[PDB]
Amino acid sequence: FASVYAWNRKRISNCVADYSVLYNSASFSTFKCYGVSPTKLNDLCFTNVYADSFVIRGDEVRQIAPGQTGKIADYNYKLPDDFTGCVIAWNSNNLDSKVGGNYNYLYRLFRKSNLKPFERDISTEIYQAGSTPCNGVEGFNCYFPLQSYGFQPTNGVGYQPYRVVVLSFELLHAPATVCGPKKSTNLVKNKCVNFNFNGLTGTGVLTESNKKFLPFQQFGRDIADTTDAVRDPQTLEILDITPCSFG
Amino acid sequence: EVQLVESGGGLIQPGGSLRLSCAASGFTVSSNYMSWVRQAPGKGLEWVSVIYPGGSTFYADSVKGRFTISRDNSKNTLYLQMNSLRAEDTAVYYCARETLAFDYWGQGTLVTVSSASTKGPSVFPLAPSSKSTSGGTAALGCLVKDYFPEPVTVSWNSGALTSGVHTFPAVLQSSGLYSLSSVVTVPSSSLGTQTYICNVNHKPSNTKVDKKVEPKS
Amino acid sequence: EVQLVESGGGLIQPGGSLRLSCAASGFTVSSNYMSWVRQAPGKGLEWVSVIYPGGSTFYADSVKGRFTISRDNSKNTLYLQMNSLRAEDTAVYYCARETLAFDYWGQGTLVTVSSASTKGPSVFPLAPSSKSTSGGTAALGCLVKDYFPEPVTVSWNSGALTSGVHTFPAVLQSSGLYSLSSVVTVPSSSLGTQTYICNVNHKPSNTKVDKKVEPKS
Amino acid sequence: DIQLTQSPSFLSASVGDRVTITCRASQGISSYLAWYQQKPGKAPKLLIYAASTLQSGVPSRFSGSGSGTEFTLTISSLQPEDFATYYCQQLNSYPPAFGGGTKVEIKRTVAAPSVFIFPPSDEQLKSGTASVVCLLNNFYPREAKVQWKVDNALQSGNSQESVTEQDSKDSTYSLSSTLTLSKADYEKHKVYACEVTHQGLSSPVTKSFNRGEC
Ligand SMILES: *[C@@H]1O[C@H](CO)[C@@H](O[C@@H]2O[C@H](CO)[C@@H](O)[C@H](O)[C@H]2NC(C)=O)[C@H](O)[C@H]1NC(C)=O
């Protein structure tokens, strides 16, 4: 994973996102959704999804939330106050903690001013405390600003490392982007049915065809402009649409 | 280097209040983790509050709410405005500059009695006697009793004698008032010869009395 | 039981202002009918304002508007924030806990002069003389004159003599400044014998002067 | 769940020796805490850093031994001047838990007390009460007994004692016991005695006076 003071930032983009494999994986110790409850994720579409990744203590997962304070949310990683995404977290004691102490996971513990939301700060200047110019030298009136979790496998819970991923769905002003999944049923034939073919809503009997579209045409129309054939998206076969009987 | 001094302690009753000023003698209280540490007498320590270089509070468990911390960087002062003291905090207060650990933390007191005594001493001189005399030395002292406002001091000869001068811990009677006695030994050849005057000062009140101790009549 | 004390009086000019704090020494100002009673000197009383246990105001007739009452239960304090004093209220203010009638109401003063004198005394000693002497006793005193800030006090020998000591009501001259004289009789055998020093204290200012009175040269 | 740290307090030793103090940790903590020196009537001073990296401005007598849990401090080659308590803490976490504190005595040998009894001052008998003070001066074993006797009747339940901190120079204790009576009850008896028992005395010492004898 990535440190807590220099988190990563992956910009998920146009694709088919299935937040159900996430939501039901039962391996996550924390799955909170803020802008939007979790089950309705696989039914919405945004412009961009960002995913931020890092590693913290066990009991600092409560500062990854909109409107908190503490050494993590103050100056390591700040979430805006109208967040939209979801926060996921799971314990990772066996991967990140090693006997003798894993001193490779640092965090920032001194900064001049709290972060703006989604702002990032990887500098390593000596936190000049005393009016006396530090001059880049340690000692008194000058602290190094980074400390390290010394993780060890025999730590009580709440001191073992947790890995965190923060998904943030954003909606600029583009034309579209990544969308959830497309729940579909099965296609029946020879029965007056109520059908929807990726947008085409109609009613009628469906029947095997013997016409041949061109391999970019979806549905066919009659003279007087009524839909009378479709192509099944999944199997790509042409089916005629006749009305069911009236008289 | 840094010599934090604090001021503001005294005596008050419940529902009272009090501002404490951790005067940052020393530098840069604008950018340091500061905190209040508390201990009742005869007890271990306890943690109260904390300010971040950037502003956050996180108060303790029992003093959740009803208790406020702040700083002032231009004055180099930490401010602790409390109120509604359950009088169950009667304690000795410390403010310490957390520097990755702690250290650098002055001292300062407080008492929150539900009474309004603050009377002062009742001083008697305990004369040097042959029952206290043994060979080369003999002991004499001053008994200062029946006072509520705990911090009281008795010196010997305006602070002159430091040999044998021993003030014993004050005792709390059933009446609710404190009492103590401070005694010093001095060569038995010198029973009445030199000056032995106990200087009693009561700081919550304004009592100042000098009492001479002489051998029994 | 209940011993209401108040604080906040002083001197100011029109359009001024002032917060008065009826400090509820005593209990439960959260749930009691409280009120302000006013009287000009030499006059009968007058009623000002009132708070309900639940919050309501109902101010008086002439002080309708321009005048605000409130409480604080956690501090056990009543708050009276006034402003724009027509200076025609120069009065002696009382705050009383209405308990189906009244009673239990401390005291506290105020003056709203349109001037800024606050100078202080002009003290002279009025010597004991044979024209004041008659038989066994003779009278001596101190004349403290020409001051605006009405509350002024003269004691005899730091508060020692209470026999014959009589301070007469201050008089208001045409100049606009007050004046008074306090006199005490003492056995004529004791004209100069003992100490007779009048201690003059002016509280709005900070004047403190001790003047000795001795028989005429 | 908060951590509750523990300590085996009330140490006693002599100079120039080795002593060792442990600190329990009743939860899985990592290895970041700190030790403090609390001289009586003063401010603490931290010695051991967040493990064993002893903070500067300290001598070479402390040796903090760290672990996952069960941390342990050790003083080797003592020096008469460490009369105070030693606490544990636990940096990192905001609300931190503190220890229980271990006072440490300085074994001496066998130094009996100077005893002295003081009758009540004439000023106090005006007021209507009689304090009878008995002083025990300098003494190692503090396990001293003060028995008041009034006309040879052992007095129970009208006395109070207090004791001083172990002296930084000669490592002794001093004790003051006060017997409190009314003027009326004082004037009903004659001999007031104070009988002190102590290891440096082969048999107890009694200091006594006779009310009303110049
Ligand atoms: C959509 O997916 C289905 C399977 O989920 C594909 O169906 C396969 O079609 C081929 C024909 O070329 C068969 O040989 C496979 O056995 C089918 N798989 C199953 C599971 O039935 C279908 O082809 C996919 N859509 C497109 C356009 O390829």
CSV table of N, CA, C and O in Angstrom, one decimal, chain C residues 145-197:
chain,number,residue,atom,x,y,z
C,145,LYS,N,-14.7,68.5,52.1
C,145,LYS,CA,-15.6,69.3,51.3
C,145,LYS,C,-15.2,69.2,49.8
C,145,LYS,O,-14.2,68.7,49.4
C,146,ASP,N,-16.1,69.8,48.9
C,146,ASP,CA,-15.9,70.0,47.5
C,146,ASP,C,-15.5,68.7,46.8
C,146,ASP,O,-14.4,68.5,46.3
C,147,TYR,N,-16.4,67.8,46.7
C,147,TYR,CA,-16.3,66.6,45.9
C,147,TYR,C,-17.6,66.3,45.2
C,147,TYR,O,-18.7,66.5,45.7
C,148,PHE,N,-17.5,65.8,43.9
C,148,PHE,CA,-18.7,65.4,43.2
C,148,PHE,C,-19.1,63.9,43.5
C,148,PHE,O,-20.3,63.7,43.8
C,149,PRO,N,-18.2,63.0,43.5
C,149,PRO,CA,-18.6,61.6,43.5
C,149,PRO,C,-19.1,61.1,44.8
C,149,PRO,O,-18.4,60.6,45.7
C,150,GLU,N,-20.4,61.3,45.0
C,150,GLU,CA,-21.2,61.2,46.2
C,150,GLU,C,-20.7,60.2,47.3
C,150,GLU,O,-20.5,60.6,48.4
C,151,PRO,N,-20.5,58.9,46.9
C,151,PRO,CA,-20.0,58.0,48.0
C,151,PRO,C,-18.6,58.4,48.5
C,151,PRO,O,-17.7,58.1,47.8
C,152,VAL,N,-18.5,58.9,49.7
C,152,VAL,CA,-17.2,59.2,50.3
C,152,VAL,C,-17.3,58.8,51.8
C,152,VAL,O,-18.4,58.8,52.4
C,153,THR,N,-16.2,58.4,52.4
C,153,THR,CA,-16.3,58.0,53.8
C,153,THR,C,-15.2,58.6,54.6
C,153,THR,O,-14.1,58.8,54.1
C,154,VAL,N,-15.5,58.9,55.8
C,154,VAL,CA,-14.5,59.3,56.8
C,154,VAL,C,-14.6,58.5,58.1
C,154,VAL,O,-15.7,58.5,58.6
C,155,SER,N,-13.6,57.8,58.5
C,155,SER,CA,-13.6,57.1,59.7
C,155,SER,C,-12.7,57.8,60.7
C,155,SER,O,-11.9,58.7,60.4
C,156,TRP,N,-12.8,57.3,62.0
C,156,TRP,CA,-11.9,57.9,63.0
C,156,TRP,C,-11.0,56.8,63.5
C,156,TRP,O,-11.4,55.8,64.0
C,157,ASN,N,-9.7,57.1,63.4
C,157,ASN,CA,-8.6,56.2,63.9
C,157,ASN,C,-8.8,54.8,63.3
C,157,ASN,O,-8.9,53.8,64.0
C,158,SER,N,-8.9,54.7,61.9
C,158,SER,CA,-8.9,53.5,61.2
C,158,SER,C,-10.1,52.6,61.6
C,158,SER,O,-10.1,51.4,61.5
C,159,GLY,N,-11.2,53.3,62.1
C,159,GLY,CA,-12.4,52.6,62.6
C,159,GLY,C,-12.4,52.2,64.1
C,159,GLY,O,-13.2,51.4,64.5
C,160,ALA,N,-11.5,52.8,64.9
C,160,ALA,CA,-11.4,52.5,66.3
C,160,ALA,C,-12.5,53.1,67.1
C,160,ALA,O,-13.2,52.4,67.8
C,161,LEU,N,-12.7,54.5,67.0
C,161,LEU,CA,-13.7,55.2,67.9
C,161,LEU,C,-15.1,55.1,67.3
C,161,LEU,O,-15.3,55.4,66.1
C,162,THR,N,-16.0,54.5,68.1
C,162,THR,CA,-17.4,54.4,67.6
C,162,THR,C,-18.3,55.2,68.6
C,162,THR,O,-19.5,55.3,68.3
C,163,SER,N,-17.7,55.8,69.6
C,163,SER,CA,-18.4,56.6,70.6
C,163,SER,C,-18.3,58.0,70.2
C,163,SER,O,-17.2,58.6,70.1
C,164,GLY,N,-19.5,58.7,70.0
C,164,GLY,CA,-19.5,60.1,69.7
C,164,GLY,C,-19.3,60.4,68.2
C,164,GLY,O,-19.5,61.5,67.8
C,165,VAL,N,-18.7,59.4,67.5
C,165,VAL,CA,-18.4,59.7,66.1
C,165,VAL,C,-19.8,59.8,65.3
C,165,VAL,O,-20.5,58.8,65.2
C,166,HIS,N,-20.0,60.9,64.7
C,166,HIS,CA,-21.2,61.1,63.9
C,166,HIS,C,-21.0,61.9,62.7
C,166,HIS,O,-20.6,63.1,62.7
C,167,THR,N,-21.1,61.3,61.5
C,167,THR,CA,-20.9,61.9,60.2
C,167,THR,C,-22.2,62.5,59.8
C,167,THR,O,-23.2,61.8,59.8
C,168,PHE,N,-22.2,63.8,59.4
C,168,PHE,CA,-23.5,64.4,59.1
C,168,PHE,C,-23.7,64.3,57.6
C,168,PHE,O,-22.8,64.1,56.8
C,169,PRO,N,-25.0,64.3,57.2
C,169,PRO,CA,-25.3,64.2,55.8
C,169,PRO,C,-24.6,65.2,54.9
C,169,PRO,O,-24.5,66.4,55.3
C,170,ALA,N,-24.0,64.8,53.8
C,170,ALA,CA,-23.3,65.7,52.9
C,170,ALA,C,-24.3,66.7,52.4
C,170,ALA,O,-25.5,66.5,52.2
C,171,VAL,N,-23.8,67.9,52.1
C,171,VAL,CA,-24.6,69.0,51.6
C,171,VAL,C,-24.1,69.3,50.2
C,171,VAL,O,-22.9,69.3,49.9
C,172,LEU,N,-25.1,69.7,49.4
C,172,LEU,CA,-24.8,70.0,48.0
C,172,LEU,C,-24.9,71.5,47.8
C,172,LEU,O,-25.9,72.1,48.0
C,173,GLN,N,-23.7,72.0,47.4
C,173,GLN,CA,-23.6,73.5,47.3
C,173,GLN,C,-24.2,74.0,46.0
C,173,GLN,O,-24.5,73.2,45.1
C,174,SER,N,-24.2,75.3,45.8
C,174,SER,CA,-24.5,75.9,44.5
C,174,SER,C,-23.5,75.6,43.5
C,174,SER,O,-23.8,75.5,42.3
C,175,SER,N,-22.2,75.4,43.9
C,175,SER,CA,-21.1,75.1,43.0
C,175,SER,C,-21.4,73.7,42.3
C,175,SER,O,-20.7,73.4,41.3
C,176,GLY,N,-22.2,72.9,42.8
C,176,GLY,CA,-22.5,71.6,42.3
C,176,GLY,C,-21.7,70.5,43.0
C,176,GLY,O,-21.9,69.3,42.7
C,177,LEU,N,-20.9,70.8,44.0
C,177,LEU,CA,-20.1,69.8,44.6
C,177,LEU,C,-20.6,69.6,46.1
C,177,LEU,O,-21.2,70.5,46.7
C,178,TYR,N,-20.4,68.4,46.6
C,178,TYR,CA,-20.8,68.0,47.9
C,178,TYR,C,-19.8,68.5,49.0
C,178,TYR,O,-18.7,68.9,48.7
C,179,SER,N,-20.3,68.4,50.2
C,179,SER,CA,-19.4,68.7,51.3
C,179,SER,C,-20.1,68.2,52.6
C,179,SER,O,-21.3,68.1,52.7
C,180,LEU,N,-19.2,67.8,53.5
C,180,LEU,CA,-19.7,67.2,54.8
C,180,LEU,C,-18.7,67.4,55.9
C,180,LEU,O,-17.5,67.8,55.6
C,181,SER,N,-19.1,67.2,57.1
C,181,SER,CA,-18.2,67.3,58.3
C,181,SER,C,-18.6,66.2,59.3
C,181,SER,O,-19.8,66.1,59.6
C,182,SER,N,-17.6,65.5,59.8
C,182,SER,CA,-17.9,64.4,60.8
C,182,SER,C,-17.2,64.8,62.1
C,182,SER,O,-16.0,65.1,62.1
C,183,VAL,N,-17.9,64.7,63.2
C,183,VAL,CA,-17.4,65.2,64.5
C,183,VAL,C,-17.6,64.1,65.5
C,183,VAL,O,-18.5,63.3,65.4
C,184,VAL,N,-16.7,64.1,66.5
C,184,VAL,CA,-16.8,63.2,67.6
C,184,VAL,C,-16.4,63.9,68.9
C,184,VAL,O,-15.5,64.7,68.9
C,185,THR,N,-17.1,63.6,70.0
C,185,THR,CA,-16.8,64.1,71.3
C,185,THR,C,-15.9,63.2,72.1
C,185,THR,O,-16.0,62.0,71.9
C,186,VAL,N,-15.1,63.7,72.9
C,186,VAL,CA,-14.0,62.9,73.7
C,186,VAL,C,-13.8,63.7,75.0
C,186,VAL,O,-13.8,64.9,74.9
C,187,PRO,N,-13.5,63.0,76.1
C,187,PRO,CA,-13.3,63.7,77.4
C,187,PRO,C,-12.4,64.9,77.3
C,187,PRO,O,-11.3,64.8,76.6
C,188,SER,N,-12.7,66.0,77.9
C,188,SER,CA,-11.9,67.2,77.8
C,188,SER,C,-10.6,67.0,78.5
C,188,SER,O,-9.6,67.8,78.2
C,189,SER,N,-10.4,66.0,79.3
C,189,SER,CA,-9.1,65.7,79.9
C,189,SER,C,-8.2,65.1,78.8
C,189,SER,O,-7.0,65.0,78.9
C,190,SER,N,-8.8,64.6,77.7
C,190,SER,CA,-8.1,64.0,76.6
C,190,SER,C,-8.1,64.8,75.3
C,190,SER,O,-8.3,64.2,74.2
C,191,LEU,N,-7.8,66.1,75.4
C,191,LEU,CA,-7.8,66.9,74.2
C,191,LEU,C,-6.8,66.4,73.2
C,191,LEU,O,-7.2,66.0,72.1
C,192,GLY,N,-5.5,66.5,73.5
C,192,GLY,CA,-4.5,66.0,72.6
C,192,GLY,C,-3.9,64.6,73.0
C,192,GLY,O,-3.1,64.1,72.2
C,193,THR,N,-4.3,64.1,74.1
C,193,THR,CA,-3.7,63.0,74.7
C,193,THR,C,-3.5,61.8,73.8
C,193,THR,O,-2.4,61.2,73.6
C,194,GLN,N,-4.7,61.3,73.3
C,194,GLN,CA,-4.6,60.1,72.5
C,194,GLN,C,-4.7,60.4,71.0
C,194,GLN,O,-4.6,61.6,70.6
C,195,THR,N,-4.8,59.4,70.1
C,195,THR,CA,-4.8,59.6,68.7
C,195,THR,C,-6.2,59.8,68.2
C,195,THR,O,-7.1,59.0,68.5
C,196,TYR,N,-6.4,60.8,67.4
C,196,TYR,CA,-7.7,61.1,66.7
C,196,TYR,C,-7.3,61.5,65.3
C,196,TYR,O,-7.2,62.7,65.0
C,197,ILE,N,-7.2,60.5,64.4
C,197,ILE,CA,-6.9,60.8,63.0
C,197,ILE,C,-8.1,60.3,62.2
C,197,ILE,O,-8.5,59.1,62.2
